[PDB]
């Protein structure tokens, strides 16, 4: 249906990609953040954000996946084949997800505006010369 | 997080369990009844409604299971064994899936209180016993 | 015909002769950040601004250039050649584009007078002796020297 | 990405195929035109229009094809070779950029609707069969 998650949001998976895949945290580590800061939110029985809606669609998504793909090693009769089918998730369904989570929970956690706005600014900034750049990366910050 | 998608829409798990697991169309009648109703919606840059942005995440997590138990068959010699992850996956994915889409399409098309009376009276109906069950089960329709 | 693409925007080819070769981002990059920040304007039916229009030409022309020159390479069995073929592209019309890409994103960002300006104080910069100007080139940059955003 | 320079312009390639490959004036005589009578704009430092800018884009393209595919057959061995690159030039991107060079020059000299209305009858002449096809094939004019 050529469906795009993160057109909604302003956002693209262009826009996305257009930072590395080895910036996005680990999905362990969004999904702890998000169990600490929204989960009575997640939990709750109300459309509080399309960006919560959003995060509880996609855990589950993440669960179905990780259920499914335990369920196949179990049966597969190589570790090595295993270990096959565990990079080929993490590192395609696994980076999606990374992207989704990140974006949604730095909207919560910031704005919408302040995460486009960010994606830019550190997609020309690992773009650009170290020299002619300011030589800290950029970050999102909650503190003044 | 024990999240669950349809508390945010007043209904539960447990008050989709009052419908059978045959009684959900397939897949594909569900996605082509989207396609058809609400594709200009789905495809829109704009949060038309939780609905709408749970059945969009909803098709990509599809996308994400197929996708995966595609490349699994495929880059598989044996495929003897595949009706075996088909079956698991139908059995268990599908019919989540089948519950999520129907829910949603049908809280568009009719309405969530329509559809949450109909649970109910569905749930009446296929708990009376067949012996004093009429055989005009309930349906969701705009006609009289 | 002696035609400058930067007189029309208040340039020359003259002050962007001084920025480096190791200044300009490499196309592909250059390419990615039109694509991330400007592509539903470039693919718009629409004038939206001169620096969109010269955006596409650029972009159409780096296009028939990679066409000429893979055909090229794909037609020559030494590799050697390819090599120095590739040279040639890379420091003739690798760096022409570069620039162009660059300064009209950089415009499109920031401001013309600003771009300018920027580019006035980086050719006072590098036309300096190291032994006699700072060590830090101006930069231009939309985030803060901190880069944290909030 | 999918951008097509025609279509800011109100056109498209789908509208500018309709006019064969051979139409199209070549390079030098649609430069000579330009000169003639826009060059005092060309070299102006003023966006006169989008047409302006986009020419000059072009003839600065058409000018670094030509630079490489000289050094190309400076550096080659072999006349036919250098027969054969130079005739792909004319054949690939000879025929975009005189496509492109027409649009713009034929657009400043008469009216970019002008020249839409063009390509539409030019089609029409070219779909219509010969034994009902005029031989005045249609022409922009300004008298």
Known sequence: MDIDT???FGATVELLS???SDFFPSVRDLLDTASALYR???ESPEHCSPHHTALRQAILCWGELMTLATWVGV???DPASRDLVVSYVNTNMGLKFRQLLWFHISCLTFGRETVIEYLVSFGVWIR????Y???NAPILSTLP
């Open 75 to 77: 049966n597969l009769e």
């Open 128 to 131: 650009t010369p170290p020299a």
């Open 40 to 42: 009575e939110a997640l």
């Open 18 to 20: 257009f930072l590395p």
């Open 133 to 135: 750049r300011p030589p």
């Open 6 to 8: 993160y057109k909604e």
